Symmetry: C2
Subunit: 106 residues, 2 copies
């Protein structure tokens, strides 16, 4: 059983807002450990042209255990993405977020 | 000195194309450890409508050992992202990629 870290997307909130993510988020999604780590903003601006430095960003990762090759995880990845989306919809409106499925190349 | 895994983006190449990444990719970038891990296609189709199931995908990550706040690692992220771009442009032309700099504003 190898542990595969699958990037899920990003979530963020105003840096002046001291949210307790450990109390707001579940420890797991689709049987996999949900991890989040504070990181520098992935891009300098939001879609509306405002700077990303005003927010604290977190990288979302699902730690998936599998006995099969990592490249065969799509079924679980899709299920986890849907479930994580539902989880994030339950967070306060002050929390912004965008999952892998909604990221776009310029 | 703790480590933070900074997701940098994706790299991919035809499954039919053999590539020894360990011999082509540098051990580090900007002094930071560069990691590559195979994962399922992050999306079913490329922008040009062609299928992604014909390619092998890898998550690119930078393992950063530091103590300072994440919102201070921006400089490293900058040169790392720049160096990583240079590295990828050095690989065979069949190799494709999408880094954080290629993302549209969130």
């Amino acid at each position: 059983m190898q542990a595969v870290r699958l990037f899920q997307g990003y979530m963020w909130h105003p840096r002046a807002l001291a949210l307790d993510l450990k109390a707001l988020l579940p420890g797991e999604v689709a049987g996999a450990r949900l991890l989040w780590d504070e990181v520098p903003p992935p891009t300098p601006f939001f879609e509306d042209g405002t700077p990303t430095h005003t927010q604290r960003f977190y990288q979302l990762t699902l730690l998936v255990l599998t006995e099969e090759p990592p490249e065969a995880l799509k079924p679980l990845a899709e299920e986890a993405a849907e479930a994580l989306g539902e989880v994030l919809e339950g967070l306060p409106p002050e929390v912004g977020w965008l999952l892998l499925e909604d990221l776009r190349p310029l």
